């Protein structure tokens, strides 16, 4: 998210075991870094290898 | 005739007069607006009690 030009980055990492669909469980993310960029974002793209 | 190259080269020598000696001039422009964030002034701490 972007808050008054500050872009907040949240991340959480945990192992799982899944075949399909998605796991059902609770998680709590934490802020990684603060990026004082100050730009408007209206679209995004996903990067895959 | 009536045509000169706008740019001219400086003449710098150790024995040149004080007026012609090279002086490194750097201007720091500080602008106050609403677009965070940039460098802030020095922040000093004190002994903890």
From Swiss-Prot, chain B:
Changing residue 8 to R: In strain: Omicron/BA.1, Omicron/BA.2, Omicron/BA.2.12.1. Residues 34-49 are annotated as: Disordered. Changing residue 1 to P: In strain: Omicron/XBB.1.5, Omicron/EG.5.1. Changing residue 16 to Y: Increased binding affinity to human ACE2. Attaches the virion to the cell membrane by interacting with host receptor, initiating the infection. The major receptor is host ACE2. When S2/S2' has been cleaved, binding to the receptor triggers direct fusion at the cell membrane. When S2/S2' has not been cleaved, binding to the receptor results in internalization of the virus by endocytosis using host TFRC and GRM2 and leading to fusion of the virion membrane with the host endosomal membrane. Alternatively, may use NRP1/NRP2 and integrin as entry receptors. Binds to host ACE2. RBD also interacts with the N-linked glycan on 'Asn-90' of ACE2. Cleavage of S generates a polybasic C-terminal sequence on S1 that binds to host Neuropilin-1 (NRP1) and Neuropilin-2 (NRP2) receptors. Interacts with host integrin alpha-5/beta-1 (ITGA5:ITGB1) and with ACE2 in complex with integrin alpha-5/beta-1 (ITGA5:ITGB1). May interact via cytoplasmic c-terminus with M protein. May interact (via N-terminus) with host bilirubin and biliverdin, thereby preventing antibody binding to the SARS-CoV-2 spike NTD via an allosteric mechanism. This is Spike protein S1. It comes from Severe acute respiratory syndrome coronavirus 2 (2019-nCoV). The chain holds residues 486 to 534 of 1273 of the full protein.
